Design a binder for this molecule. Structure first.
Ligand SMILES: O=C(Nc1cccc2cccnc12)c1ccc(N2C(=O)[C@@H]3[C@@H]4CC[C@@H](C4)[C@@H]3C2=O)cc1
Ligand SMILES: NC(=O)c1cccc(N)c1
Ligand SMILES: [Zn+2]
Length: 199
């Protein structure tokens, strides 16, 4: 209702002009949101709130919770089994983590894989406007977030930290990206079924 409209507003307002020229996610300025489904998985929520509490206690009664986008070819697995760092790619910009973004267009670059992979399954198009894509709008506990400006391949959060904020840099990092090294620090709150729209 008002809950889904703010999700739809956040999905549209956070689109950016990508330094890849739309190569990975596609050519678009806006989406066509088809459905917003609220994921209600109590076992995943219990895991999330438990870790959230531990984190708050190690960061001045502050979880540093953010509402962030996640784009991955594994969204249906995530909605059932939750985020899992055991599946995290080791050679990512910030290492073996679960990457999230404030800009839905960044998460959109990863729905079919790193640099959009091949593209959509049935047409093999990264800029496909026909096939329906899926993004997750997640509750993310960042806790004590470590600000890293360059590439740093780490396996776990830096000592005393609960995440990594990959802040924007000239040579080279276009937009912010939030990385957790523990799956229990994010809850797949909303499942956005959408299509990127041709300008
Ligand atoms: O929890 C995740 N997967 C799964 C969760 C439950 C079950 C699963 C079963 C099978 C496979 N996966 C599963 C998950 C972890 C890490 C990443 N991940 C990456 O592999 C890299 C590239 C892709 C997005 C950006 C760049 C980054 C990232 O966030 C995506 C998803
Ligand atoms: N997979 C994603 O949604 C994502 C978010 C931020 C940064 C990166 N690299 C990926
Ligand atoms: Zn397609």
């Amino acid at each position: 209702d008002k809950e889904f409209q703010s999700v739809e507003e956040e999905m549209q307002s956070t689109v950016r002009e990508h330094r890849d020229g739309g190569h990975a996610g596609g050519i678009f300025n806006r989406y066509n949101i088809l459905k917003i489904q609220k994921v209600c998985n109590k076992k995943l929520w219990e895991r999330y709130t438990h870790r959230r509490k531990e984190v708050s206690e190690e960061n001045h009664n502050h979880a540093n919770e953010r509402m962030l986008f996640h784009g991955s070819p594994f969204v249906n697995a995530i909605i059932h089994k939750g985020f899992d760092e055991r599946h995290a790619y080791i050679g990512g910009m910030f290492g073996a983590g679960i990457y999230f973004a404030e800009n839905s267009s960044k998460s959109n670059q990863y729905v079919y894989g790193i640099g959009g992979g091949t593209g959509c399954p049935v047409h093999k198009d990264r800029s496909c406007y026909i096939c329906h894509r899926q993004l997750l709008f997640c509750r993310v506990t960042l806790g004590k977030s470590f600000l890293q400006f360059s590439a740093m391949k780490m396996a776990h959060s830096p000592p005393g930290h609960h995440s990594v904020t990959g802040r924007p840099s000239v040579n080279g990092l276009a937009l912010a990206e939030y990385v957790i090294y523990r799956g229990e620090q994010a809850y797949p709150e909303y499942l956005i079924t959408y299509q990127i729209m041709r300008p």
